[PDB]
Amino acid sequence: LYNILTEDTESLTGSDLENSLKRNFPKVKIKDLMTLDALANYYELPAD
Amino acid sequence: RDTLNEAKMWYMQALGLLGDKPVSIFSNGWENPSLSNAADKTQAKQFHD
Structure with a gap:
């Protein structure tokens, strides 16, 4: 988790953005994660 | 204990209604x-128009 929170994800363009989304989100569909219920349940915090 | 599991199944039925x-x-x-x-x-x- 320190290696996750360490990453310089800001100002990262090109195919390295795709690689970072593939690493930090291996299994989900990002388009399925965009809704608020998915962001509540995936990180296990209330939607409020 | 068993009556607490009864309580949980009643409240879960109510959440199923909501x-x-x-x-x-x-x-x-x-x-x-x-x-x-x-x-x-x-x-x-x-x-109203």
Whole structure:
């Protein structure tokens, strides 16, 4: 988790953005994660 | 103990009736209007029209 929170994800363009989304989100569909219920349940915090 | 599991199955049945808790929106098309602008007579005339 320190290696996750360490990453310089800001100002990262090109195919390295795709690689970072593939690493930090291996299994989900990002388009399925965009809704608020998915962001509540995936990180296990209330939607409020 | 068994009566506490009874309590849990009753409250889960009630949650099954209610369903999914409705997320109240706050990011909204609600601008912050003027009270003069919010209480226009045209604003109710057009509505009921």
